[PDB]
Amino acid sequence: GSSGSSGKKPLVCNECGKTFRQSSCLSKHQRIHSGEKPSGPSSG
Ligand SMILES: [Zn+2]
C-alpha cells in the first residue's frame, strides 16, 4: 500500500536549519539571515 512518496517537503531554513509549519513563518524568519533583497552584484 504505497502511500505515494510524491513530495510534501517541509519548510526549513537553509541558513540555520529550522523547520516551520507555515510558509510565511519560515520566510519571515529567513529575513534574519538575509538582509535586503538580492539585487545582483551587490549581495552576491
Ligand atoms: Zn534561519
From Swiss-Prot:
A zinc finger (C2H2-type) spans 11-33. It is found in: Nucleus. Belongs to the krueppel C2H2-type zinc-finger protein family. Interacts with the SLBP/pre-mRNA complex but not with SLBP alone. Interacts with LSM11 in a U7 snRNP-dependent manner. The C2H2-type zinc finger 2 to 6 are necessary and sufficient for discrete Cajal bodies localization. The C2H2-type zinc finger 5 to 10 are necessary and sufficient for interaction with LSM11. The C2H2-type zinc finger 2 to 8 are necessary for interaction with the SLBP/RNA complex in the histone pre-mRNAs. The C2H2-type zinc finger 2 to 10 confer activity in histone pre-mRNA processing. Involved in histone 3'-end pre-mRNA processing by associating with U7 snRNP and interacting with SLBP/pre-mRNA complex. Increases histone 3'-end pre-mRNA processing but has no effect on U7 snRNP levels, when overexpressed. Required for cell cycle progression from G1 to S phases. This is Zinc finger protein 473. It comes from Homo sapiens. The chain holds residues 699 to 729 of 871 of the full protein.
